[PDB]
Amino acid sequence: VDFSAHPWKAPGPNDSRGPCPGLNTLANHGFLPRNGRNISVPMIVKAGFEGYNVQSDILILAGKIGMLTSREADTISLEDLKLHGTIEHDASLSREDVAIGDNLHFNEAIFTTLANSNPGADVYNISSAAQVQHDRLADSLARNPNVTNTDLTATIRSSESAFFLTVMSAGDPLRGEAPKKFVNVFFREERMPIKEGWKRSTTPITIPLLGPIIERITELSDWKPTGDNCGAIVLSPE
Amino acid sequence: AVDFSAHPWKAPGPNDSRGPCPGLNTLANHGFLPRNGRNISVPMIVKAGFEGYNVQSDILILAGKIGMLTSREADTISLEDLKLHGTIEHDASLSREDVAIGDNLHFNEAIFTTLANSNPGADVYNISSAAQVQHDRLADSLARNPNVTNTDLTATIRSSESAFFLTVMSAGDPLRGEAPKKFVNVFFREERMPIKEGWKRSTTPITIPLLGPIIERITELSDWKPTGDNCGAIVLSPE
Ligand code: HEM
Ligand code: HEM
Ligand SMILES: [Mg+2]
Ligand SMILES: [Mg+2]
């Protein structure tokens, strides 16, 4: 992996970007196509390995679910992933709920909750991620009459916290903690925080590595389901 | 541009991967998909279904990407992978047994007795008879399968599959919502395009807008109602 051959570039109007900081950051570095188009599961598997040392087990599983969001046979544009109720969910860390705002773009007012978490410490961790999930869900339950909160959205949310905690770690992703200086750049700029001192994990990030972090965040989050608790996903756009 | 003479039916070998879907198994039996049933991608399905049946990309991209969930591979399946229960594969099939009480993969003539003897007095199967068969097959599963799953999603998939055989095996106008029995029976029993019987590829493209009203008509005629867990949750991956 030569990271100097993968410089960050800001997206312009030819560049599709979605609700996922992980994939948007890979596109901003050219590990995925910079235009955010014509993205296949094999391209995601390779880009996640090269950029983040994320292994194929999770990227095939998630990637094939994400492909459902487009109208194309075996590719997406990253913006397609905003399709509500496939993967995209309410009570995001950095986006608004679709019923009451913009479910696509980074939103600093939403991000405030994560940004102010684990106060006095230099890291986010499992405990602070759980508290943020609790507080984000409580915000959606208070303000969004159309909130969807189910076993499946709760699991996806904890997967996403585990992703930022592992991929943006100081080098040992097992530990379930990540420097704030790295995670904040990842979200706010969709940039690998290389200038700040981040490096790609030398440990493969796999389903067995993520699973305990996901389950422990859920356990500490004081979570309950809402409504019919139906794990049905949206299988296609329009 | 399709040359059917270059696509002869050959009986599948015991080692050729085949699934629960007569549409894709027939395409493989004619070499529109690989005859071994392996290494099949959505683009391959789109091309095969266009060439073989005049089924357009909208419906094959939608179905195909859901089918891709049934394998552990990045962008392909084997046909047999599509037997994964609760992705697309469902109870109350027209020609297969429910997985909890039998074989959910192979054509079963005993199960097929219901469809084969439907629309009595006509030489076609139609929207009304397909609806009645869906009612009767679901009633069988509700009676005999203690693990039966019947949701708005499974009911819609079942109507879609009836609409597929009525349109693709039609006597040439798929809008009619009827297909000759002599064609449909070969399609199911042999997973063969009934070319010597007089079947020809539709000259009307079969699309989501074409199918939608047929599917809705089959559903309403089938007298379907929710019975239990009505959550349209699918199985998103093998274990
Ligand atoms: C490659 C490693 C990946 C990392 C590090 C990553 C990270 C993240 C994070 C941290 C979020 C939460 C954003 C928020 O709550 O505001 C998220 C959201 C999302 N990710 Fe990813 N992700 C990755 C891969 C994937 C893949 C493969 C897909 C699908 C192909 C995907 C689809 C999504 C979608 C649709 C959302 C929006 C969910 C929501 O917040 O409503 N991600 N991702
Ligand atoms: C190409 C045109 C297609 C036609 C004409 C067709 C036709 C059918 C029909 C008539 C059945 C019902 C069998 C029964 O109930 O015994 C069926 C089942 C099935 N089809 Fe297809 N199909 C096509 C394409 C597809 C595609 C693209 C996929 C997925 C990639 C697929 C996956 C399935 C599966 C999994 C089943 C089993 C459902 C069940 O009966 O439990 N089909 N198909
Ligand atoms: Mg969201
Ligand atoms: Mg079945």
Residue numbers in the entry:
A (entry chain B): -2 to 235
B (entry chain A): -3 to 235
Source paper text:
Unspecific peroxygenases (UPOs) are enzymes catalyzing the oxyfunctionalization of both aromatic and aliphatic molecules, including specific products that are difficult to be obtained only by chemical means. Therefore, they are of high biotechnological interest for the regio- and/or stereoselective synthesis of biobased compounds and other fine chemicals and pharmaceuticals. These enzymes form a group of fungal heme-thiolate peroxidases (HTPs). Hence, they share a proximal cysteine residue acting as the fifth ligand of the heme iron with the phylogenetically distant cytochrome P450 monooxygenases (P450s), present in all living organisms. In the present study, two UPOs from the basidiomycete Marasmius rotula (rMroUPO) and the ascomycete Collariella virescens (rCviUPO) were crystallized after sequence optimization and Escherichia coli expression as active soluble enzymes.
The asymmetric unit of the rMroUPO crystal structure includes four polypeptide chains that associate to form a tetramer composed of two homo-dimers in a head-to-tail arrangement, each of them stabilized by an intermolecular disulfide bridge (between the Cys227 residue of both molecules). Each of the rMroUPO monomers is compact and spherical in shape and consists of residues from Ser1 to Glu235, which displayed clearly defined electron density (only lacking the C-terminal Leu236), together with one heme molecule and one Mg2+ ion. The overall fold is mainly helical with eleven α-helices and two short β-strands (V120-N122 and E174-P176). Moreover, a clear electron density could be detected at the active site that could be unequivocally assigned to an acetate ion from the crystallization medium. The heme cofactor sits in an internal pocket with its iron ion coordinated by the sulfur atom of rMroUPO Cys17 at a distance of 2.4 Å in the lower (also known as proximal because of the cysteine ligand) side of the heme cofactor. One of the acetate oxygens is near the sixth coordination position of the heme iron. The Mg2+ ion appears coordinated (at 2.07–2.19 Å distances) by the Ser89 hydroxyl, the His86 (backbone) carbonyl, two water molecules (wat1 and wat2), and the carboxylates of Glu85 and heme ring-D propionate (neighbor Asp87 is not involved in Mg2+ coordination). In rMroUPO, the dimer interface buries 825 Å2 of each monomer and is formed from the interactions between residues of the C-terminal loop and residues from the helix α4. From the C-terminal region, an intermolecular disulfide bond between the sulfhydryl side chains of Cys227 and the hydrophobic interactions established by Ile230 and Leu232 contribute to the clustering of the dimer. In addition, residues Ile62-Glu69 from the helix α4 increase the dimer stability by polar interactions of Lys61 with Ser67 and Glu69, and by a patch of hydrophobic residues at the interface (Ile62, Leu65).
